Design a protein around this motif. Structure first.
Motif, PDB file in Angstrom:
ATOM      1  N   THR A   1      -7.443  -0.664   7.180  1.00  0.00           N
ATOM      2  CA  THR A   1      -5.744  -1.398   5.591  1.00  0.00           C
ATOM      3  C   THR A   1      -6.524  -2.531   4.838  1.00  0.00           C
ATOM      4  OG1 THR A   1      -4.181  -1.446   7.880  1.00  0.00           O
ATOM      5  CG2 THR A   1      -3.329  -2.114   5.465  1.00  0.00           C
ATOM      6  N   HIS A   2      -7.588  -3.073   5.295  1.00  0.00           N
ATOM      7  CA  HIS A   2      -7.922  -4.735   5.505  1.00  0.00           C
ATOM      8  C   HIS A   2      -9.012  -3.912   4.112  1.00  0.00           C
ATOM      9  CE1 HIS A   2      -9.994  -8.159   3.921  1.00  0.00           C
ATOM     10  NE2 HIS A   2      -9.547  -8.888   4.374  1.00  0.00           N
ATOM     11  N   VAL A   3      -9.808  -2.702   4.372  1.00  0.00           N
ATOM     12  CA  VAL A   3     -10.141  -2.584   2.753  1.00  0.00           C
ATOM     13  C   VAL A   3      -9.280  -1.418   2.216  1.00  0.00           C
ATOM     14  CG1 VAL A   3     -12.016  -0.489   2.284  1.00  0.00           C
ATOM     15  CG2 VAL A   3     -12.074  -1.530   4.646  1.00  0.00           C
ATOM     16  N   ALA A   4      -8.530  -0.878   2.396  1.00  0.00           N
ATOM     17  CA  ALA A   4      -7.501  -0.161   1.683  1.00  0.00           C
ATOM     18  C   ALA A   4      -7.034  -1.233   0.654  1.00  0.00           C
ATOM     19  CB  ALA A   4      -6.647   0.143   2.262  1.00  0.00           C
ATOM     20  N   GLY A   5      -6.634  -2.474   0.865  1.00  0.00           N
ATOM     21  CA  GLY A   5      -5.551  -3.423  -0.322  1.00  0.00           C
ATOM     22  C   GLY A   5      -6.549  -3.511  -0.782  1.00  0.00           C
ATOM     23  N   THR A   6      -7.940  -4.238  -0.838  1.00  0.00           N
ATOM     24  CA  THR A   6      -8.508  -4.681  -1.850  1.00  0.00           C
ATOM     25  C   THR A   6      -9.696  -3.464  -2.892  1.00  0.00           C
ATOM     26  OG1 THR A   6     -10.744  -5.749   0.104  1.00  0.00           O
ATOM     27  CG2 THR A   6     -11.274  -5.334  -2.080  1.00  0.00           C
ATOM     28  N   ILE A   7      -9.813  -2.344  -2.140  1.00  0.00           N
ATOM     29  CA  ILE A   7     -10.233  -1.119  -3.271  1.00  0.00           C
ATOM     30  C   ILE A   7      -8.021  -0.977  -4.176  1.00  0.00           C
ATOM     31  CG2 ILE A   7      -9.948   0.991  -4.206  1.00  0.00           C
ATOM     32  CD1 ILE A   7     -11.526   1.456  -0.755  1.00  0.00           C
ATOM     33  N   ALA A   8      -6.866  -0.988  -3.743  1.00  0.00           N
ATOM     34  CA  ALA A   8      -6.044  -0.413  -4.666  1.00  0.00           C
ATOM     35  C   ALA A   8      -4.840  -0.922  -4.406  1.00  0.00           C
ATOM     36  CB  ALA A   8      -5.797   0.729  -4.769  1.00  0.00           C
TER      37      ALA A   8
ATOM     38  N   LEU B   1       0.569  -1.235   0.405  1.00  0.00           N
ATOM     39  CA  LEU B   1      -0.145   0.174  -0.060  1.00  0.00           C
ATOM     40  C   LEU B   1       0.823   1.061   0.081  1.00  0.00           C
ATOM     41  CD1 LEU B   1      -2.114  -1.596   2.684  1.00  0.00           C
ATOM     42  CD2 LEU B   1      -3.586  -0.911   0.991  1.00  0.00           C
ATOM     43  N   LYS B   2       2.482   1.532   0.232  1.00  0.00           N
ATOM     44  CA  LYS B   2       2.410   2.123   0.547  1.00  0.00           C
ATOM     45  C   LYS B   2       2.777   2.892  -0.410  1.00  0.00           C
ATOM     46  CE  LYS B   2       7.287   3.933   1.906  1.00  0.00           C
ATOM     47  NZ  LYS B   2       6.036   5.150   2.479  1.00  0.00           N
ATOM     48  N   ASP B   3       3.146   3.032  -1.539  1.00  0.00           N
ATOM     49  CA  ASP B   3       2.735   3.926  -2.842  1.00  0.00           C
ATOM     50  C   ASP B   3       1.151   4.522  -3.669  1.00  0.00           C
ATOM     51  OD1 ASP B   3       5.768   4.462  -2.582  1.00  0.00           O
ATOM     52  OD2 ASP B   3       6.338   2.593  -2.694  1.00  0.00           O
ATOM     53  N   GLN B   4       0.555   3.352  -2.737  1.00  0.00           N
ATOM     54  CA  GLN B   4      -1.067   3.568  -2.712  1.00  0.00           C
ATOM     55  C   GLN B   4      -1.499   5.093  -2.487  1.00  0.00           C
ATOM     56  OE1 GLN B   4      -0.603   2.383  -6.291  1.00  0.00           O
ATOM     57  NE2 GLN B   4      -2.304   1.082  -5.658  1.00  0.00           N
ATOM     58  N   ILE B   5      -1.369   5.211  -0.928  1.00  0.00           N
ATOM     59  CA  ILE B   5      -1.721   6.047  -0.309  1.00  0.00           C
ATOM     60  C   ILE B   5      -1.055   7.623  -0.557  1.00  0.00           C
ATOM     61  CG2 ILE B   5      -1.760   6.975   2.039  1.00  0.00           C
ATOM     62  CD1 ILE B   5      -1.157   3.611   1.847  1.00  0.00           C
ATOM     63  N   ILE B   6      -1.531   8.766  -0.566  1.00  0.00           N
ATOM     64  CA  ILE B   6      -1.550   9.797  -0.983  1.00  0.00           C
ATOM     65  C   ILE B   6      -1.680  10.899   0.017  1.00  0.00           C
ATOM     66  CG2 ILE B   6      -3.767   9.812  -2.541  1.00  0.00           C
ATOM     67  CD1 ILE B   6      -3.117  12.656  -3.478  1.00  0.00           C
ATOM     68  N   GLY B   7      -2.306  10.551   1.435  1.00  0.00           N
ATOM     69  CA  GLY B   7      -2.380  12.229   1.918  1.00  0.00           C
ATOM     70  C   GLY B   7      -3.175  10.477   3.563  1.00  0.00           C
ATOM     71  N   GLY B   8      -2.985  10.911   4.706  1.00  0.00           N
ATOM     72  CA  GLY B   8      -4.348  10.282   5.752  1.00  0.00           C
ATOM     73  C   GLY B   8      -4.511  11.891   6.700  1.00  0.00           C
TER      74      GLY B   8
END
Ligand SMILES: [Ca+2]
Ligand SMILES: [Ca+2]
Ligand SMILES: [Ca+2]
Ligand SMILES: [Ca+2]
Lengths: 7, 290, 290, 7
Positions: B70-77, B41-48
């Motif tokens: 994080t689980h939701v995140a991974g499923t998206i992208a 996920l590291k380079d997928q996240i653009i802000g927090g």
């Protein structure tokens, strides 16, 4: 007063 | 390190072929946060951005104490570029909105409203929510309303509080608002999940049973709930947007993409109150060409 | 009765089977007016207002001195008994708004806007226009925007300035406004009609060549142009609004019905610039059950 | 002045 949780 | 059977079932690979992997799409993820250093996920996240109590309300701290976010995140992208797992839109970008604090994973409506208003001011294409609340609060409805008229696709899990009877309804918010793309869950035999909320505001259903995605600390794991269905739709919206902006040669509006979303759905025989338009299936129009 | 070629081709009867014939849908036919005493149409009308100059602004006189409004109104909802022909939605009701005067079928943007707002004021379900003009007058986009705001479906023929060539755009309004469901024209065999305007705002296409429907004074006849294609869509949303509202067991909103329009569409092997989403094909998600 | 014809 109003709450949500994941699901 | 491939593609969760769930994500192949909704037919996302067959859209990657045509070069529709999410590029150019920002998706705000309103959840328990996200461990932003996970390789997948590291380079997928653009802000927090934090709106819950955790970490003295340090707004830049979005650490996911629960896992689900994080689980939701991974499923998206989730990207595989570090030898990891894939999401539905692995060339899209996530914004992390932490609206659920503490480890049991629960946040106050004003925090949800905070993150929804934020997400739109940041002009995301997609708000993805996997939370539910039993009460209909008018400040919530209006925030939902304002974001949608702004052009944001607002997706929410439909609600876990279901029983199996399509004659008895359960209402989870914000899902229950007509504007939301409310996502119910199905078996991977696509039968309606027993816990899938029934009402007249289900739009479609996705896989929500035993879903593999990323967990904090370079880990993985399965989970369950309409909280797993929603990210399938959220991610899928991003590649639908990719496929349709190319075919139409312009940017597509919020209602248009919704039409395009329910156009990529095959119907089921169960009641529309449980399954909405049907199962998220991104190759449905081709199936029509045969 | 011998329902027209084109109406069978869009699969309307296969929805008449289910009981969806228009009951309770009200459609405002903005056009040249109509001969309100044609056997196949006298019952189906609930009123008429004229904003032209014919009869000297006698607003109660909507009589059709061109023939197109009656042909259009016939294509939407002509009645089977008294002999004669079947519209797409024979169980629905029509409102005759006359904003096009004389035999050349012209009117000012004043009279169009007036009637649009008059149909909105009268709280109808669909606005079928088969008009078109090269100027982009904000006040017209105003009127449609307000009408869709209130929750009307706004249908308009796409324009007859096409030159067969998808690399060249031709603009006609109000079809060209994103908010308007723009309808282009194909043939018997679903081939893009050369005159159909090409742009990035075509939503779908319908039969637009040699369509036989009612002409004034108990007469019939064939006409050609996108003006013939839009009424196929107008009458279709009537049927569709009845179908999906049963399936969901509630009333649908304007973005939901639109989505359900595009779902009953059939992907075409021609550019979206000419055909949009494809051919109005009302059994299309049944073709997905296979 | 706008104006528009049947189409
Ligand atoms: Ca239930
Ligand atoms: Ca909805
Ligand atoms: Ca052309
Ligand atoms: Ca449109």
């Amino acid at each position: 007063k109003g709450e949500i949780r994941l699901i």
